[PDB]
Structures are given as C-alpha cells and as structure tokens.
Amino acid sequence: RENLYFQGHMREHLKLFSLIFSYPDEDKLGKAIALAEGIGLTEIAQTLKQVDIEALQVEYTSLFISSHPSVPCPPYQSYFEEGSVYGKASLRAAELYSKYGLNYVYESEPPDHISVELEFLSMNPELLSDFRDWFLEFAKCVEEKSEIYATFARAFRKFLEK
Structure with a gap:
C-alpha cells in the first residue's frame, strides 16, 4: 500500500x-x-x-x-557542509527529526547521513527545498568520483x- x-x-x-x-x-x-x-x-x-x-x-x-586517502564521497551533510563528520549538521538533522517527532532509532550512523535524511524527506518532502544542495554537492562528487x-x-x- x-x-x-x-x-x-x-x-x-x-x-x-x-x-x-x-x-x-x-x-x-x-x-x-x-x-x-x-x-x-x-x-x-x-x-x-x-x-x-x-x-x-x-x-x-x-x-x-x-x-583510501580519506573516503571519496563521505555521505554526511557535515563533511559536506562543515568539513568533519559528526558536526553541527548532525545536531541540526537530529534536532529536526525530533521536531517532526520522528524517533531516530539508529545505531551505526549519524543522523546527518544522506540515506537517513532521505527516509526523513520521504516522509516530509515539503522540506526537500532545504536539504537539497548538500544532496547535490554530494550527488556530483559521487557522479565524478x-x-x-x-x-x-x-x-x-x-x-x-x-
């Protein structure tokens, strides 16, 4: 369904x-x-x-x-936005998941990881407008790399x- x-x-x-x-x-x-x-x-x-x-x-x-040197296209909107993994992005991500009262029941990965933000947007696609360019500087990195x-x-x- x-x-x-x-x-x-x-x-x-x-x-x-x-x-x-x-x-x-x-x-x-x-x-x-x-x-x-x-x-x-x-x-x-x-x-x-x-x-x-x-x-x-x-x-x-x-x-x-x-x-390899570092990971080619690290799939985190911190590395991309801010440089390292596990940064402000991550707090913000998480903040908002909880703002949407989604419960981030996850283990291995920071909340600012693409795959997650995606599940999140697949629920609240309104907010794509936001998460987009990161979703993109990324998108190209992978396309080239x-x-x-x-x-x-x-x-x-x-x-x-x-």
Missing part, C-alpha cells in the same frame, strides 16, 4: 534514493529493484536488477566507507534538478 488517491510518487522516489545510498544488500537490493519497479522508474531498475552484489558493495565501500554508482548518482541529480 501506497496511495489510491493522490497523484504520484515523489515520496516513493525519495525512499528509493535512500535505499540506493545505504550499504547494499540482498534485501535492500530486493526492496529497491521493487520500489523502482512499482514507482516505474525503469532503467534505474535493470541497472539495479542486474549487478554483482559483491562488487556493488565494494564500490560503495571504496566510495563511502574506507579511507566513481563508476558503478555513478548511474544513480546522476539520475539523482537529474531528479532533484527537476
């Missing part, structure tokens, strides 16, 4: 992107290739539908988790560029 009376899929779309930008797995890849198909965004579905999970991770990891992921990374920009 997604809605039988209001035209169309932004929220749905957002959740896809949030999925597209976590560390991947059989399940996430499942859900995504599915949201993808449901919301009908198509090429972005095959692209997903047909990749070697092992390798997918690996890029993910080369891109976001491990420090590496290959499997790039597709999405563009598609994403392409997305919020509309």
